[PDB]
Amino acid sequence: SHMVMEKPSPLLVGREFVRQYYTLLNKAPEYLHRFYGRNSSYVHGGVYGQNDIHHKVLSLNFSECHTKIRHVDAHATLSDGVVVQVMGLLSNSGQPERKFMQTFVLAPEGSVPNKFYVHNDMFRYEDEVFG
């Protein structure tokens, strides 16, 4: 029983990504599109293409967005990718906290080497789905 040297642990890649993702969302939301490729999908309910994602984020207007991460779980998936499920609270522009469930699919960048990009991003508010 030894540690895998070839690939980074999926759980650490997910947690570190979530940490940086929501941090940048609070700081500079306009640079958030740099996490996605020209084939990624962004859904914030409430889109395929990085340029469409950039315009999508700006249309949401994130002004000092604070996030309380309640749960994060990340596993390894297809083609050495990482799938992450995130549950927590979201408060944007002074509005009160809203329970959400955001899921990511972290894909390894082409080359090289240990670089990842968001291949899938699905965001859903709880009060809009259940009530």
Binding site: E16, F17, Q20, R34, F35, Y36, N114, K115, F116, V118
Partner: peptide, 8 residues
Amino acid sequence: LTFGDFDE
């Protein structure tokens, strides 16, 4: 471990 076009 880097994400996107960042060196952080």
